[PDB]
Design a protein around this ligand. Structure first.
Ligand code: HEC
Ligand code: HEC
Ligand SMILES: OCCCCCCC1CCCCC1
Ligand SMILES: OCCCCCCC1CCCCC1
Lengths: 106, 106
């Protein structure tokens, strides 16, 4: 992370985040939780919001570095996302699948 | 990739893939393309099927290795997927947003 443009970041939040998040202290939850005080806190802990199983599966102390990686692809931390288009968690499942597919497709 | 179980792989296809793919020669397209002969071709060129922009973005001659990685998370290669929950392409976009969010959330 390198410090960038807070003005451009504001426009980004408004057009990319605001539809599911508020950020001001005491702001309401929406589809996603209010993000006030998120950087001095652990993930999956906003008062008054109950998260998916994502927050018992991974747990970070938010900072610029780990949030930058999060925001690369937040959808993959939402359970169900990977399975929706055929994603397979277990490497053995993927081996098994491919072994069959190589035969079934020839 | 290690050779695995074609019978377990077959149950996996039926329950995880079949809803969007067929595999037999001459099989119909569904939401996704028929996969006959997939291991003998490049990605994104099944006859009679027209793909998302994913196939002018990423290109691969399919084999066990690169399809194992694909099947880790296929939804990642569908355009729109990352953006849907606030995903940010550009590093500088991410930098800008975090710079703003650190202030906005204090
Ligand atoms: C725009 C770029 C953003 C940013 C900066 C964030 N989001 Fe979201 N968010 C959504 C949902 C449903 C959740 C909960 C996920 C779950 O329960 O598994 C989240 C969570 C977050 C976090 C973590 C919050 C915490 O308390 O740890 C963060 C940092 C975050 N978001 C930032 C939903 C959405 C959207 C719905 C369509 C959209 C759009 C965004 N988020 C976009 C962004
Ligand atoms: C279950 C485990 C599987 C497996 C083995 C595969 N899929 Fe899918 N698939 C879907 C869509 C819409 C596409 C095209 C995406 C695009 O146009 O960008 C695909 C594509 C593939 C490929 C590549 C095909 C090629 O010719 O290169 C492969 C190898 C593949 N799939 C395997 C849609 C879906 C689903 C819809 C809900 C589901 C479920 C799956 N796919 C699951 C699987
Ligand atoms: O590895 C960098 C991303 C870590 C994501 C942490 C999970 C988080 C829990 C609750 C809210 C959704 C995502
Ligand atoms: O690094 C992983 C390589 C796999 C890329 C798969 C691209 C494919 C092209 C068009 C159809 C779906 C995705």
């Amino acid at each position: 992370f390198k410090a960038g443009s807070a003005k451009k970041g504001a426009t980004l939040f408004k057009t990319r985040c605001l539809q599911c998040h508020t950020v001001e202290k005491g702001g309401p939850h929406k589809v996603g939780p209010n993000l006030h005080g998120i950087f001095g806190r652990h993930s999956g802990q906003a008062e008054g919001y109950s998260y998916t199983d994502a927050n018992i599966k991974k747990n970070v102390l938010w900072d610029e570095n780990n949030m930058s990686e999060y925001l690369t692809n937040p959808a993959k931390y939402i359970p169900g996302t990977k399975m929706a288009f055929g994603g397979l968690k277990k490497e053995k499942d993927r081996n098994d699948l491919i072994t069959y597919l190589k035969k079934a497709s020839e």
